[PDB]
Chain A
Amino acid sequence: EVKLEESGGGLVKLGGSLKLSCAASGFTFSSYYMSWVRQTPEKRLELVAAINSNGGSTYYPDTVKGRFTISRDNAKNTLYLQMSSLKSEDTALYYCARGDYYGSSLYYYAMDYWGQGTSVTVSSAKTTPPSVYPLAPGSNSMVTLGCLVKGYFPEPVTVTWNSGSLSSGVHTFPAVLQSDLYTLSSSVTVPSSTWPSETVTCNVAHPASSTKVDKKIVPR
């Protein structure tokens, strides 16, 4: 059983700096080539850096070489990736996968085990707490409701209906970025007998701004 866990991602302004981490578990960490791979918002994969067994040789693409530093601590089973002079194209989900074994008789240059990744955003936009708006029909046995989470930054954002007790019929649409602000919406479908005869609440949470709002869907 193997495990890879990242940590350290967040929001930084243009030119800032960050230091990520990679928790190795379930294998001899001092025997494999470790590297970092990111995923641009447009769903593109790019190698950012790689390191060998010990802290010897390292590799950095030209698009990153000169400002990212990839170190490792075999004694502590940890992989690091210093990030400095972060530009806009640096925003992405950074992974840390495992490379070839130290002695494989021949290298494959493939990454067989990845991680869940740590999101990193590089922007001069100011953290804006979102505004939650209830979506109710204005005057079918099924009724659709929803709440509007407009104007917030940065990602991510979470939403649940009736404290997670409403899994079916829920739809959380990916946010849209326009003018340095995100906007998300989520709909829920329930039987007409349950609303407005009962209470349907929308649970929104914004870790970035550290805000959490509960909103009911009153008729009319």
Chain B
Amino acid sequence: DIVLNQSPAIMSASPGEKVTMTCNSSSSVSYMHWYQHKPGSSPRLLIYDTSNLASGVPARFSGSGSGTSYSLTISRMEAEDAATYYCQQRSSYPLTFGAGTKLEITRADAAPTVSIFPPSSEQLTSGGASVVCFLNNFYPKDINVKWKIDGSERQNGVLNSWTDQDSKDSTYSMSSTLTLTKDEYERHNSYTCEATHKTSTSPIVKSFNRNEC
């Protein structure tokens, strides 16, 4: 086992921009490989033996590094190159792969579209109640969503989930589901969903009440 630290874990790049990612090893290695992995497809050999490009690879990809430090370079970034790259050592067995570097596309900031949904009548029959709040199409990825029950905040019972960067607009969509019990749900009135984002200095507030409709 040879630890291969890939830095950084995640990073963004704009089209035409230069991207450089390293991959240091705990022990000296003779050569280093590089693979490109994109969601929906299988891994792809990108560079073999440090600086040798595989078949049908654009010249913008270049390999370098020796000893305990290997780097993968992209002359000018493009949306076609948004994926996760893994480095592999080929000096000792077993053949180990690095943690991986996730490369995202940099686009213009986009405000999220918030939307809160009360629990359905089907779930309330089973003694459960889940309040969902969608935040669709925004950038960058980092975003904070907060819950409030009758004014008071709730941090336990929430389950967030982001989506991979969309290939069309290159935005991020995030979901948040607050699950509770039927009794605890029928115990309060105001259910609010707050969304604080880079493009939203103040929080975007969406709420509803049980004493309406």
Q: List 13 A-B contacts (CB under 8 A).
A: A46-B96, A47-B94, A62-B94, A110-B45, A114-B42, A114-B44, A131-B126, A133-B123, A135-B117, A171-B173, A175-B161, A185-B132, A185-B161
Q: Mark B98-120, 1 if CB is under 8 A from A, else 0.
A: 01100000000000010101111
Please name all residues of chain B whose beta carbon is closer than 8 Å to the beta carbon of A43 when the two chains form the complex: 84, 100
A110 close to B33 (CB less than 8 A): yes
Which candidate, B85-93, B182-190, B196-204, is the interface stretch facing chain A?
A: B85-93
Assuming A133-B130, A135-B132, A139-B208, is B117 touching A173 (CB within 8 A)? Answer: no
Q: Mark A106-128, 1 if CB is under 8 A from B, else 0.
A: 00111111111100000000000
Q: Is A148 an interface position by the 8 A CB rule?
A: yes
B interface list, Cβ under 8 A from A: 33, 35, 42-45, 48-49, 54-55, 84, 86, 88, 90, 93-97, 99-100, 113, 115, 117-120, 122-123, 126, 128, 130, 132, 134, 136, 159-163, 173-175, 177, 179, 208, 212-213
Q: Is A31 an interface position by the 8 A CB rule?
A: no
Please name all residues of chain A whose beta carbon is closer than 8 Å to the beta carbon of B44 when the two chains form the complex: 114
CB < 8 Å neighbour of B163 from A44, A117, A173, A220: A173
A136 close to B49 (CB less than 8 A): no
A111 close to B134 (CB less than 8 A): no
Assuming A148-B130, A183-B159, A185-B132, is B120 touching A114 (CB within 8 A)? Answer: no
Given the complex of chains A and B, what is the CA–CA distance between A111 and B36 in angstroms?
A: 12
Interface SS majority for chain B: strand
Considering only CB atoms, which chain B residue lies closest to A145 in the complex?
B117
Whole-angstrom distance between the Cβ of B41 and the nearest chain A Cβ? 8
A114 close to B90 (CB less than 8 A): no
B95 close to A47 (CB less than 8 A): yes
Whole-angstrom distance between the Cβ of A41 and the nearest chain B Cβ? 13
A173 close to B162 (CB less than 8 A): yes
B113 close to A144 (CB less than 8 A): yes
B132 close to A146 (CB less than 8 A): yes
Assuming A131-B122, A144-B113, A173-B173, is B134 touching A187 (CB within 8 A)? Answer: yes
